[PDB]
Amino acid sequence: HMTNLQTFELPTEVTGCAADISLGRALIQAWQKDGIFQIKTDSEQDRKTQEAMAASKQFCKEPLTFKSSCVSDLTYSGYVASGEEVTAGKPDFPEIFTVCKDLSVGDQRVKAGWPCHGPVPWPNNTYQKSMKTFMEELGLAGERLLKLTALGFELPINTFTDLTRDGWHHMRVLRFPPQTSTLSRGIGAHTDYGLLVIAAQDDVGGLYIRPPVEGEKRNRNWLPGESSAGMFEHDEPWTFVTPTPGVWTVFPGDILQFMTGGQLLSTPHKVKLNTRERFACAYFHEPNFEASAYPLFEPSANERIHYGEHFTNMFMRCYPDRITTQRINKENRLAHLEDLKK
Numbered sequence: 001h002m003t004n005l006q007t008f009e010l011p012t013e014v015t016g017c018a019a020d021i022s023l024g025r026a027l028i029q030a031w032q033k034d035g036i037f038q039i040k041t042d043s044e045q046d047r048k049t050q051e052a053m054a055a056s057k058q059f060c061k062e063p064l065t066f067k068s069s070c071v072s073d074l075t076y077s078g079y080v081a082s083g084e085e086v087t088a089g090k091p092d093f094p095e096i097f098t099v100c101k102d103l104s105v106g107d108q109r110v111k112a113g114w115p116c117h118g119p120v121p122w123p124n125n126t127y128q129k130s131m132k133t134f135m136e137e138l139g140l141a142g143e144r145l146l147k148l149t150a151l152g153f154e155l156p157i158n159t160f161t162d163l164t165r166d167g168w169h170h171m172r173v174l175r176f177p178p179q180t181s182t183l184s185r186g187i188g189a190h191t192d193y194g195l196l197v198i199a200a201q202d203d204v205g206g207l208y209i210r211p212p213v214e215g216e217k218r219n220r221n222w223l224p225g226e227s228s229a230g231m232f233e234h235d236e237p238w239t240f241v242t243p244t245p246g247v248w249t250v251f252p253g254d255i256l257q258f259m260t261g262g263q264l265l266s267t268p269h270k271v272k273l274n275t276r277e278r279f280a281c282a283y284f285h286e287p288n289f290e291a292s293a294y295p296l297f298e299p300s301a302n303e304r305i306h307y308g309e310h311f312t313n314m315f316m317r318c319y320p321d322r323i324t325t326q327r328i329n330k331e332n333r334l335a336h337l338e339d340l341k342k
């Protein structure tokens, strides 16, 4: 396949042998030079990817009245209309179904009113099964990647996985419309918020990523005064992520940039509308909602990122008018975050 990125195959199990350490070095190097790489999918990884894309296509054909009903005031899971999300003050144009951790009202965290905790408003049970199976496979890959990354930095194999038990993994199931006006913006420039972003796309094309740039200051999106949203949109360089069959892409999120002190950067990226609609799934391999990330290479440093606080801050800014956000504000659910930080 004519591709524009490096492609690696992951071992099923990462044990810490010499081959694993070598692979970790290569993944770190690819992120440091290109900001991204591809991982080869096996037949089951690919099958589950395609079944998820098919379920997304069927869901998006449903009437807006139905899609709009798939929302929750407890969790951000569920439907986002085209034009609803905001990035740096401007609307984004995909329709989205967000899948966060699927917690019923029987869950203790939901009973306690923790922000963002609640059940996915699945459109139907076939969609549910397809997305759950796909996300379980994506999670296995995320864990492999985190073990390899630790090994490549000469850290204990468990360094990042010790933050991801019951991790706050989630996924955006996206359909981008074709460009119809002179507007070609799909999503504005941004970074995502956790450890890794693992993504799949169809054959259409539209994702651009920004590699590391020597001498370029990068905002630390975990700080309220350094948002990465809306940065570098029109400025070179941007790498086109050529659609390639049988791969997922992988790039760092904000937590990986923080923990590595910028040795890895949270990859800025944006989406442009193409002449045809475009289906994609972006998966976020995240710390536990309660985990506090810390700098690995600066053990004098007292700075921390409480991951759940970062997620909640980000989703409130994405969806300022959503019923989920309104209920966080109404019930003072951010107070739970203050207690957890103790």
Ligand SMILES: NC(=[NH2+])NCCC[C@H](N)C(=O)O
Pocket (backbone or CB within 6 Å): 085, 086, 087, 088, 187, 190, 191, 192, 229, 314, 315, 317, 318
């Ligand atoms: N929920 C997301 N991950 N959204 C990604 C797009 C950027 C997001 N709207 C922001 O302002 O940070």
Ligand SMILES: [Mn+2]
Pocket (backbone or CB within 6 Å): 190, 191, 192, 269, 282
């Ligand atoms: Mn993104």
